[PDB]
Amino acid sequence: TQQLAVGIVLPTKDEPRWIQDETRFREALQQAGYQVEILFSQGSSAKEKENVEALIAKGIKVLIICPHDGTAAAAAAEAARAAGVKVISYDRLIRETDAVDYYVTFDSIAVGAQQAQYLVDHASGTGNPLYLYAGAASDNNAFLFFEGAWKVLQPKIADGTFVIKNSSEAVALQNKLDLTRDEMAKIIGQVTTNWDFNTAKNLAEANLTAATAADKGKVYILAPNDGTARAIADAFAADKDVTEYFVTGQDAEKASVQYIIDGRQSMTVFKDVRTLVQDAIKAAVALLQDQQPEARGTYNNGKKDVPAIQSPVVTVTRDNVRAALIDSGYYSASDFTNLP
Ligand SMILES: OC[C@H]1O[C@@H](O)[C@H](O)[C@@H](O)[C@@H]1O
């Protein structure tokens, strides 16, 4: 194999998502005969910065980095740039610095839009209960997923289709389509899962305890990713006054694919991590060759419109789980029971 002057930093092993990227990186690197070190940050911006400093000292020329905390990662990105290291922000955006060269990402606005659109497409009449949930505020993607969803849900709240049951801040904002970041942050504060299973389950339980029978029945749940969706679904499934629920997700985690098969989760947004990984490797290799990656479009990070290498996202339900996840080669059918 060849050692590449590239280092990969991922935020934590305690969010299942990053295990997918770890796996997919290792597979892609093995295929190409490349050796590249992967370090995890253990959900610590200080450790993340250390990781970057260690990689700089090992002589990396390109850093692929998914920040734990996007704004906090600014000094790490700046340290890399200061040592002549190119900075590819990966999946999540490093904020509040111009020390980001590229951003390899899925279309996160479209993830939230697709989540919300699924809920809308399955609701009729008026006064349908709507329960909102969000990611960690330290993740810029949590704001993007929420925005994408809000821009679909808000008109359907304003027109009486949905009634928000778990966020007074969202209710006070429900006739405003274009929320500021500070406004979104107030909603997210009330409905945050912190990308954590127990936190999500407990919040759903608290919400259900506060809610009355009139707020239940057939309900609509904006869950921001797969693990939090299962936690929330588990709470809602247990409430006898919830006669039916529709719940969203993303990442196509295996356990959620099984919930979808089994009728316990309604959908997931599939984000093909194989593409994200290859996009990052390709950009790194181009930079190592003193060439520019192929970026189209930008994401603003508070200081800079960062050139984007963006990949699409796809809604997966029972109707297309086989086409989207199995026929695509993402997963073996043998991973699941009773795949339609
Ligand atoms: O790990 C929590 C979440 O972090 C987000 O920034 C990633 O884009 C999601 O795929 C993941 O579910």
XYZ file of N, CA and C and ligand atoms in Angstrom, residues 15-18 66 91-92 106 108 139 141-142 145 195 224-226 250-251 271, ligand 1:
72
model
N -21.881 8.097 18.322
C -22.967 8.330 17.374
C -22.781 7.318 16.271
N -23.800 6.481 16.013
C -23.567 5.364 15.074
C -23.105 5.780 13.671
N -23.521 6.970 13.242
C -23.228 7.459 11.901
C -21.751 7.291 11.572
N -20.880 7.670 12.520
C -19.442 7.737 12.200
C -18.783 6.374 12.071
N -14.429 15.944 10.199
C -15.789 16.151 10.615
C -15.773 16.678 12.053
N -18.758 16.147 5.975
C -20.140 15.955 6.422
C -20.697 17.177 7.133
N -20.013 17.617 8.189
C -20.384 18.792 8.971
C -19.413 19.897 8.663
N -23.465 15.832 2.158
C -24.765 15.541 1.579
C -25.597 16.815 1.515
N -28.006 18.588 2.968
C -28.701 18.544 4.260
C -30.050 19.258 4.300
N -23.756 20.953 16.008
C -23.662 20.430 14.639
C -24.380 21.381 13.698
N -25.204 20.899 10.800
C -26.219 20.138 10.062
C -27.548 20.097 10.803
N -27.534 20.154 12.133
C -28.793 20.147 12.885
C -29.642 21.353 12.484
N -30.854 20.606 8.776
C -31.944 19.646 8.733
C -33.223 20.307 9.245
N -28.358 14.239 19.495
C -27.929 13.060 18.716
C -27.659 11.854 19.613
N -34.955 13.431 13.865
C -33.914 13.955 12.969
C -32.960 12.910 12.407
N -32.793 11.772 13.087
C -32.001 10.695 12.491
C -32.517 9.350 12.939
N -31.875 8.273 12.501
C -32.394 6.921 12.763
C -32.425 6.507 14.225
N -32.947 9.430 9.346
C -31.927 9.443 8.311
C -30.735 8.605 8.740
N -30.000 8.159 7.717
C -28.703 7.447 7.782
C -28.839 5.973 7.371
N -28.367 8.411 2.837
C -27.223 9.229 2.452
C -26.070 8.271 2.151
O -24.479 11.526 14.255
C -25.588 12.428 14.269
C -25.851 13.021 12.903
O -24.829 13.959 12.630
C -25.132 14.630 11.405
O -24.332 15.770 11.296
C -24.906 13.643 10.272
O -24.997 14.270 8.988
C -26.027 12.635 10.422
O -25.899 11.675 9.377
C -25.930 11.976 11.789
O -27.139 11.226 12.020
